[PDB]
Amino acid sequence: SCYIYWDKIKRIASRLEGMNYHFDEMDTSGVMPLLDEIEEIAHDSTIDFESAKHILDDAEMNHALSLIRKFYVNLGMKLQMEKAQEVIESDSPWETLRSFYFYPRYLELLKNEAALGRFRRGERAVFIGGGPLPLTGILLSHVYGMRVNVVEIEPDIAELSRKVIEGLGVDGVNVITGDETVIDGLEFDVLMVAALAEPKRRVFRNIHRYVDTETRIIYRTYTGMRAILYAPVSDDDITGFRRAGVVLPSGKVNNTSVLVFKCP
Amino acid sequence: SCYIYWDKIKRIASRLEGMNYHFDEMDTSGVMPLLDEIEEIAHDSTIDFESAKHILDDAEMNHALSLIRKFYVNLGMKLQMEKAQEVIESDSPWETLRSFYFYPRYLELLKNEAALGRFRRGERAVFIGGGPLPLTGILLSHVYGMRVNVVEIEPDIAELSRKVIEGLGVDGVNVITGDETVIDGLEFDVLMVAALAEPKRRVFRNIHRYVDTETRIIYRTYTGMRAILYAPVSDDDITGFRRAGVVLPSGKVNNTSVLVFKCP
Ligand SMILES: N[C@@H](CCN[C@@H](CCC(=O)O)C(=O)O)C(=O)O
Ligand SMILES: N[C@@H](CCN[C@@H](CCC(=O)O)C(=O)O)C(=O)O
Ligand SMILES: [Br-]
Ligand SMILES: [Br-]
Ligand SMILES: [Br-]
Ligand SMILES: [Br-]
Ligand SMILES: [Br-]
Ligand SMILES: [Br-]
């Protein structure tokens, strides 16, 4: 085979590689064009899922794919870091938060997930992998009226996220510093696994130990050409669970959301 | 994992075990309820492709999958043979043809394919693997006004398919007895490969030698839970071609249709 996307992807990866050579520290404003070139490929609706695997998972794409995925992770993290601090400093913190590049996507994504998980006001939710900008946790309370624990493994990132929540005046959102294993000590009706929470295999094995067969578990993944952004959760990762629902994204939304329940 | 469909599949397969190595001896009328049981699962739109893959790829499912596929291919062949002979003997051949159990699905399948392959009246189509009831060839002319050569490897089957075409009074449909390599001496705009055309490896490697990069090639395969019916075309099979489009079936249609082009 002979996909025209292969050359386009390799050239983007070459640009990323040259950039990384010069700077470890991401220039978030400067790389927005690169992100948009990548998302135009990711959002190409003409490409079916099987074809996406044929193009993205080809052996000769491995190196380029790894560069693009690392870029997406590092950019997303830096954008979150920068926005968190902006929110904390702002006299108009909600207006500041809504300016986050990806903000409207979260509204659409969470709508999807709330239907999939049958979210109800007052239910307890745990979100594993809050990051510096705990937007999903914030929305689960602010929009869905859930009582939320957000879990974050890096103590300084956890601290930042707490200041963001305090800055916005959002109630019902607590941040727990620790790994996924903290769920042993929490009551919850629904558990969500962040798109970038890693390592997947470990996270799901630990989840399996601590949840029961009634716990609604939603995880975020990448399918079709959106897999250019990040490695999907594999079926091996979710051994001991059964899939019970999936929402495929459209528009600009990147994540696929999967509902699973612990067997048996 | 713990899908309800696992046991349901195993149960159906247990009732096929005693027919193993002798499915060709089946009473087609008598086994229709079995096909319905299998299709109940195959056609269940709540089973996502990841779940279907989990079930169907499991080593413990291999024997059951083999039984179901043998049943399906033998029932399909026998239904086709019986119908071909009925049509040839009928005073009302088109009415007889339209009573074929799968007839409505062919209309939908072809409708999807016509859009995918951008079929235009008067275009020249070659169909590899007519079988005794060359319904696709018949409809390509009758519905889409294409000029058709159907290719059939077995002389006796070729003779039967000619009699069906002639019985119906269909114009612009000819049967060529030979292997796939007969396309060397043909001039055509669209090439189609039947769902049951085998061996895929040899067939596609031969196709690659004769077509050019402009030839629209459509092949039929099985995806998701419908792969319970018949082995999907493997990635190995279509090496040297690029995928350009797909139609995934809905309702009762079994086949996925794939548009490919020879590289580059
Ligand atoms: N931050 C969220 C992920 C939210 N994804 C959104 C925003 C855009 C993106 O992440 O590429 C989406 O899918 O469109 C998490 O940690 O799960
Ligand atoms: N006979 C055709 C296949 C026609 N498939 C139809 C009929 C049902 C079936 O084959 O199970 C379909 O997908 O619904 C061929 O060999 O290409
Ligand atoms: Br504000
Ligand atoms: Br988040
Ligand atoms: Br199930
Ligand atoms: Br039975
Ligand atoms: Br057999
Ligand atoms: Br046919």
Q: What is the CATH number of the domain that holds A69?
A: 3.40.50.150
Closest CA to B7 of B70, B43, B58: B58
What six digits make up the tokens of A186? Answer: 């929490």
SS3 B205: helix
Where does A130-215 show beta strands of DSSP type E?
A: 147-152, 173-177, 190-193
Distance (Å, whole) CA A229 – CA A252: 13
Distances (CA, A) of B123 to A76, B145, B189, B202, B244: 50, 8, 6, 26, 20
Type of residue numbered A194 = A
For B229, other C-beta atoms within 10 Å of its C-beta total 22
Q: B242, B256, B257, B263: best mutation site toward chain A, by most A Cβ within 10 Å?
A: B242
Left (φ > 0), alpha (ψ -120 to 50) or beta: where does B61 sit? alpha
Q: With contacts defined as CB-CB under 8 Å, which chain A residues touch B263?
A: 1-2
What six digits make up the tokens of A194? Answer: 């962040």
CA A174 from chain centre, in angstroms, equals 19
Evaluate whether B162 touches B87 at the Cβ level (below 8 Å): no
Total domains present in chain A: 1
- Breaks in chain B (C to N > 2.5 A) come right after none
Sheet holding A216-221, edge to edge: A173-177, A147-152, A124-128, A190-193, A216-221, A256-262, A241-247
- How many cross-chain Cβ pairs, A to B, lie less than 8 Å apart? 43
Distance (Å, whole) CA B55 – CA B66: 13
Type of residue numbered B232 = P
**B246: β partners:** B258
Protein residue whose Cα sits closest to atom 11 of ligand 2: B254
Distances (CA, A) of B152 to B26, B175, B194, B198, B260: 25, 7, 11, 11, 22
Contact with chain B for residue A213, Cβ under 8 A: no
Distance (Å, whole) CA B165 – CA B135: 9
**Experimentally determined by:** X-ray
Burial of A207 (0-12, 13-18, 19+ CB in 10 A): buried
Distance (Å, whole) CA A226 – CA A56: 10
Resolution in units of Å: 1.7
Is the four-CA dihedral A196, A199, A205, A207 of positive or negative sign?
A: negative
Distance (Å, whole) CA B203 – CA B260: 14
> In sequence order, what DSSP letters do the residues of A31-50 get, joined into one string?
THHHHHHHHHHHT-TTS-HH
Contact with chain B for residue A98, Cβ under 8 A: no
Type of residue numbered B3 = Y
What is the span of the domain harbouring residue A28? Answer: 1-264
CA distance to partner chain A, nearest, from residue B50 (Å) = 7
**A192: β partners:** A127, A218
Q: Does ligand 2 come within 6 angstroms of the Cβ of B255?
A: yes
Distances (CA, A) of B71 to B18, B65, B152: 11, 10, 23
For A84, other C-beta atoms within 10 Å of its C-beta total 23
CB contact (8 A) between residue B240 and residue A1:
yes
Residue position matching structure tokens 């490695």: A231
